[PDB]
Each structure stands twice: as C-alpha cells, then as structure tokens.
Design an enzyme around this catalytic site. Sequence first.
Site, PDB file in Angstrom:
ATOM      1  N   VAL A   1       0.856  -1.181   0.000  1.00  7.33           N
ATOM      2  CA  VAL A   1       0.000   0.000   0.000  1.00  7.33           C
ATOM      3  C   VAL A   1       0.898   1.239   0.000  1.00  7.33           C
ATOM      4  O   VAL A   1       1.844   1.319   0.789  1.00  7.33           O
ATOM      5  CB  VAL A   1      -0.923   0.017   1.245  1.00  7.33           C
ATOM      6  CG1 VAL A   1      -1.823   1.261   1.251  1.00  7.33           C
ATOM      7  CG2 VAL A   1      -1.753  -1.261   1.327  1.00  7.33           C
ATOM      8  N   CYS A   2       0.599   2.192  -0.881  1.00  7.59           N
ATOM      9  CA  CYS A   2       1.238   3.515  -0.869  1.00  7.59           C
ATOM     10  C   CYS A   2       2.754   3.342  -0.935  1.00  7.59           C
ATOM     11  O   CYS A   2       3.234   2.584  -1.794  1.00  7.59           O
ATOM     12  CB  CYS A   2       0.682   4.242   0.348  1.00  7.59           C
ATOM     13  SG  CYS A   2       1.001   6.005   0.354  1.00  7.59           S
TER      14      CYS A   2
END
Lengths: 226, 226
Positions: free
Chosen positions: B99-100
Amino acid sequence: AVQIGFLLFPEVQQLDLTGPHDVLASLPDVQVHLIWKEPGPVVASSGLVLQATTSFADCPPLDVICIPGGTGVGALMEDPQALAFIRQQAARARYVTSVCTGSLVLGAAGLLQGKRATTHWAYHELLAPLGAIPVHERVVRDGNLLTGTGITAGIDFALTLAAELFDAATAQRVQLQLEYAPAPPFNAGSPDTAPASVVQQARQRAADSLHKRREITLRAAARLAA
Amino acid sequence: AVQIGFLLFPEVQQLDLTGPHDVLASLPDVQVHLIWKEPGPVVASSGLVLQATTSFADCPPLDVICIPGGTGVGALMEDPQALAFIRQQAARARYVTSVCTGSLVLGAAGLLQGKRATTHWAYHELLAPLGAIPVHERVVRDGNLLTGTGITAGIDFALTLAAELFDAATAQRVQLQLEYAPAPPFNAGSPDTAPASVVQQARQRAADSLHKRREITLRAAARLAA
C-alpha cells in the site's frame, strides 16, 4: 487546539475508529483522544490490540465526539458510566458523530430522540424504539448530529468535518496527501445492490446478534421512558 | 488456514494496515499476523500504538504478505533484517502486496526489478531507480505482485484477494456485512483531479521527505547493483 475524541471499547470494530483517526490526526492543531474507563489495552473484535489514552474523568471537553460500532455495542448500550460520559460531552460538543452501529449507543444515551439518523442496514429496525426518525441514507445530519453507515463512513465524514472546522482547501489537501480515491471491485455494499442470495446469507449470519440486540434495545428504551 | 501477514514498523501509516486487516480478518479460516522484530508495542506515525504479534523468526510461511507505507519507510529501505525477511516470505507467498509507499520497501528488497508497479504520487519518481516499470494506475498487478495507491488501497484489493482465495460470493458477502460503499465528499484524491493550488501545497509539504528519500533510494539501488 481542536479536541477530538473516539470511544474505544472491547469488541469495537476497529476500522470504524482507525479510519477517521488517521484522517483527522493529519490536520493541524488537532489533539485526538482514545477514551475508555482507564488508559491501557482494549481489544477489538478482530483481536487487534489498541491502547486507550485517557479515562472518562480525565478527558478534556471535546469539540468532536465519535462513537464507533462493533460487536461490543450491545454491552455499551447498558453501561451507565459510558452513557453518562457521552451525554456530558454531547452537551457542549460542536459535532456528535457515529459510525455503523455506534448510532445505537447514541440512541441508548437518549441523543436520537426526535432526530433523523441511520445505522447498519441489518440493525436499522432498532432506531425507532430509541426515538429516532429512521433514514436510509449513508450519511444523515440533524443539527450537530452526524450518523454514517459503512465501515469507512468516518473517513468520508472526517473530510466534511475538516472542511467545516478549517476550510475546503484544507480538506482537499488532506485527501490528496492520502491519495484517497476509493474504487471497490464489487458493488455489493448495500442490500439494494448486492445479489439476493448474498443478502440472505448476510441476514442469516446476523440473526442471532439482531435477536440479542432487540432485547437490549427494549431495556434501553425502558430506561429512556423513565 | 490461510496465513496473512502485515509488516508493522515504527512510523507506519496505520490505516494502510488497519483497513485490509479488518477486511481480511472477517474471512473464514484466515490467521492474520502483525510482524516486527519482536512482539510488542509499535507506534504509528499518528501516535496510535499497535501491537506486533510475532517476530520475524517465529512467523509461519505466509500465503499473503502486505507491506504498508508511512514515514517509517525510509528506515525500512535500509534495514537488512527486514529486507531479508520480506525476500524470504515473497519467495513462496501466493500474493506479495503493498500500500502507498510500501512499494518502495519492496523495491529496496529487489522485488520490483523488471516489474510493473505504482506508489504514492509524490514519490513515484523513485520507482525507476529501483528497477521497476512505473505505472500511474491505482492498482497494478504483475504476476503475484499487487501494488496499490491510496491510504485505503488495501481495503479494495483485500476484496479482490478474498474473491481469488475463496470465491466472488464470499467477497460480496464481506462487502455487504461491512456496508462498504465509499462516497468521498471531495474529488481531490489524485494530482490530476485536485485544484492546482492544492497540488502545489501538497508537493511543497512533501519536498523535504522526497529529498531524503532520493538519497536513501540511491543507496538502496547501489546495494541491488552489487
């Protein structure tokens, strides 16, 4: 500093809380509190362990109070210490908010009487006995009360709060910094859009919990009638 | 039981982790681990205190590994113990996800070489020096690698994982049980949709972090070149 408080209780649905927490904690000049009867570990319904930061007695006057939902709501609806704390803070808070079944706690505290409100779709029938006007919308505002549905309702309404406490450009900046632009791969997040077979399975799995919460709701309503 | 593991490190962006955790923990026959060098408290970038449940040495072989992002990614990109653990688990995992800015950790571990991948918009230029083919899409799949952008990317891709590990009806049921149907009140979650003035403010606020991460990325790339 704006004071924002989340109630953190055993068997909370942690994402109801951790979503808005991370958004609001990104804002300038905000202090965020995780409130329970004393500081220390509190276990969410998944087993994730969180840590309350302050007690009821030590919590400062809040500008925003947020009640998450979860399995643990049933006990909270008959916890006189928690209900009294919520009533005390709601009297002066600029915003009184809840996520999912957290609105049933606001109902047990008497704060939905005569107010438009929503809750989780499987428990929506419990709003009217708590004095609310039930509304089937994802976010329902009535004065300074905001109730939202969905495990991530608080992420979305946190951006609304940011815009009203600060300004729209501040809310937009937080959204961009978090690159927040959801796109679910399925469209089954409402009983009106999910397949009927899926709705049946979900209803059946909630049936025992709904039955127990009918009993709790009637006792909570009796206390409000006194 | 399917074994799912999240890396939990100091200064993690907690929602990157807590979102997918609550979704995946709702599935039957899943065990979810929060992994660090030893069990015990780990503080997220907001100050929220989480608890790791297992050490690197005691973690079982994982079917899914997920690397969240956050401020703390910079240290993790030069942590040889963490990078070695990620490589070991990725060798046999059915899904390797991030994520991210968690994808920058996968990059430092060497797992993006020749692979299509994304990361947070403000750090996207750091993918190519780590060997990746940069892609400006919210979810990018390349074999068993999934990289996603947005603080809630893991909520959305957790539903995809649920459908592939189990079936579509199971993913739909989880979505309905969580009443997950987001509707952000602003449309500023991408640099392509936010106002230019907001993009400028966000870029300026990230500039010092980007500068430091350029330096770290070059050292990480040198290690991959050896």
